[PDB]
C-alpha cells in the first residue's frame, strides 16, 4: 500500500469510424503544486497503440519501462515481429490489466488509471480502461479521473452508442476532444493548458501531436462580474 506523490490528471479518449483518438495534458502535479510541465503521459507502443496514463508518475515511468521491454522481448526469435507477430493493442492491454490486478492483489498497486487506444490488425478499433484495482471496461468514449465527470458527457453527445461510431469523422472526433481539453482546463484545478493528442487510424496510421494548447477561451464576461451579491462596483 502506498500513496501517489507526483500525479497526472485526466486522460480522455473516444473512437470514430476509422480509429481512435486519445489525449492527456503535460502536467505532473505534486499535491496542489503544479510542479512539472514537460510530462508526456501518452505512451506509443509500436505504431498501432498508444497507452494514456494518469495517476502516480513514478509508477507511470515504471509502466513505460515495462512497455519498452514488451517490444524488445516480442522481437526476440520473432521473424514476423514487424508483421503478423507484432504487438496488438489487445495484447498490450491484457498484459497491463494482468499486472494491475496482480499488484492490487498483493496490496501494492501501481497507482494509475490507464486507457489503451489502438487499432487491431483487422482494423477494429480498440479502447479499454484498467486502473489500480485491476478493474476494466470498454465504451465508445473513455476518460479517467476528472475527465470521467466532464469529458464523457461531452464526448457522448457525439458518440452515444455503438451505431454512432461509423457516423463519426476524425474531424468531428478531434474537435470534441480538443473542446473537452479546454473545458477540463476551465474547471480542473490540476490541469495544464498544454497537452498531447494522438490518433490511430486504420488508414493514416498513428499521428502523434505534441505541444498543443487550449485556445479560444472565453474570459471577457469576467469583467462584468463584481462582488458576490449586493456590491455594485
Amino acid at each position: 500500500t502506498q500513496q501517489p506523490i507526483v500525479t497526472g490528471t485526466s486522460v480522455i479518449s473516444m473512437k470514430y469510424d476509422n480509429g481512435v483518438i486519445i489525449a492527456a495534458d503535460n502536467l505532473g502535479s505534486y499535491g496542489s503544486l503544479l510542479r512539472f510541465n514537460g510530462v508526456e503521459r501518452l505512451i506509443p507502443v509500436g505504431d498501432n497503440t498508444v497507452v494514456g496514463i494518469s495517476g502516480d508518475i513514478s509508477d507511470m515511468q515504471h509502466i513505460e519501462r515495462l512497455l519498452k521491454d514488451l517490444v524488445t522481448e516480442n522481437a526476440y526469435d520473432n521473424p514476423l515481429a514487424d508483421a503478423e507477430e507484432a504487438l496488438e493493442p489487445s495484447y498490450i492491454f491484457e498484459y497491463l490489466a494482468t499486472v494491475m490486478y496482480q499488484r492490487r492483489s498483493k496490496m501494492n498497486p501501481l497507482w494509475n488509471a490507464i486507457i489503451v487506444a489502438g487499432v487491431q490488425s483487422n482494423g477494429d478499433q480498440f479502447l479499454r480502461y484498467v486502473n489500480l484495482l485491476g478493474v476494466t471496461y470498454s465504451s465508445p468514449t473513455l476518460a479517467t479521473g476528472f475527465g470521467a465527470h466532464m469529458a464523457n458527457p461531452l464526448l457522448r453527445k457525439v458518440v452515444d452508442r455503438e451505431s454512432d461510431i461509423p457516423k463519426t469523422t476524425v474531424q468531428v472526433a478531434e474537435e470534441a476532444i480538443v473542446n473537452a481539453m479546454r473545458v477540463l482546463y476551465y474547471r480542473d484545478a490540476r490541469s495544464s493548458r498544454n497537452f498531447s493528442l494522438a490518433i490511430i487510424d486504420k488508414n493514416t496510421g498513428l499521428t502523434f501531436k505534441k505541444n498543443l494548447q487550449v485556445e479560444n477561451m472565453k474570459w471577457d464576461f469576467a469583467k462584468d462580474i463584481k462582488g458576490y451579491g449586493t456590491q455594485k462596483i
Binding site: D77, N78, P79, E84, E85, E88, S90
Partner: protein, 233 residues
C-alpha cells in the same frame, strides 16, 4: 571408449559427443512410426498406434495442447506427457496474460530450451521421446519436429519412429503435390495416410490401429480414432 563417456549427460566424449543424448534418441527409433505434413491451409498428424497384446489397447500417440496446436509422440510416453503438459501451460499462459494464441514457432523454441536443460546438468536425464507439432497460427499452418537433443525444426512434412525413413522419402517426393492441398482436409489426410503406409511392414493400418489429427484455417485441432478414421483405410 564410449563406455567411459556415456555414464551421464554431463560428459563429453573425446569426439565431442553426448552419448546419453544419443541413447535417448534411440528410444525414439524404437517407437511406433508417426507422420506430419501440411499445406497452406491445414496441418495433419497421422500416427500408427502400437498395441502390447491382442488383448491390449493401441496406445494414444496424439495430444492436443490448445485449440490451435497439438503433437504426435514417438518414444517414452511419459516424457511426451510431461512435454505436452508444459506446452499446454505455455499456450495457456499466452492466452491468459496477453490474450494471444501462442505462435507454433515460439512453442518450438520453448520446447527446445526445456529439453536443453536436461542435457547440461548432472542428475537429470535427456527426454526419451520425439515429437511432431502442428498448428495454425497468425502465419498459417505449421509442422515442427522435436528431438530430445533439443533440436526443433520446421518442415512441410516428416516422420519419426521405426521405419520412418519410408514415409519421409515419400513425402520428400510428394512435396510439390501435397503442399498445395489447400481447402481440402480429406485430401491432405489421405496423403498423410499414404506416407505412413510407406513405413508399414508388419501389418496394415486397421480401424483401432490408425490415429489422425488435423488443425487449420477454420478447423480447431481435433483427433480422429477408430470408426472416425475408417473412411481413410
Amino acid at each position: 571408449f564410449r563406455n567411459n563417456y556415456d555414464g551421464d549427460t554431463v560428459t563429453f566424449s573425446p569426439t565431442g559427443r553426448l552419448f546419453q543424448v544419443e541413447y535417448a534418441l534411440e528410444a525414439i527409433k524404437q517407437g511406433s512410426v508417426t507422420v506430419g505434413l501440411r499445406s497452406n491451409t491445414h496441418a495433419v498428424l497421422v500416427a500408427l498406434k502400437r498395441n502390447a497384446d491382442e488383448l491390449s489397447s493401441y496406445q494414444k500417440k496424439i495430444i492436443k495442447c490448445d485449440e490451435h496446436m497439438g503433437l504426435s509422440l514417438a518414444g517414452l510416453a511419459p516424457d511426451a506427457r510431461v512435454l505436452s503438459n508444459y506446452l499446454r501451460q505455455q499456450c495457456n499462459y499466452s492466452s491468459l496474460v496477453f490474450n494471444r494464441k501462442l505462435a507454433v514457432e515460439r512453442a518450438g523454441h520453448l520446447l527446445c530450451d526445456k529439453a536443453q536443460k536436461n542435457t547440461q546438468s548432472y542428475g537429470g536425464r535427456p527426454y526419451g521421446v520425439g515429437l511432431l507439432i502442428i498448428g495454425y497460427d497468425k502465419s498459417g499452418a505449421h509442422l515442427l519436429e522435436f528431438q530430445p537433443s533439443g533440436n526443433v525444426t520446421e518442415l512441410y512434412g516428416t516422420a519419426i519412429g521405426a521405419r520412418s525413413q519410408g514415409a519421409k522419402t515419400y513425402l520428400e517426393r510428394t512435396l510439390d503435390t501435397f503442399i498445395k492441398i489447400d481447402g481440402n482436409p480429406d485430401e491432405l489426410i489421405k496423403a498423410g495416410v499414404e506416407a505412413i503406409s510407406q513405413s508399414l511392414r508388419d501389418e496394415s493400418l486397421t480401424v483401432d490401429n490408425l490415429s489422425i489429427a488435423i488443425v487449420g484455417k477454420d478447423t480447431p485441432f481435433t483427433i480422429y480414432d477408430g470408426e472416425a478414421v475408417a473412411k481413410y483405410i
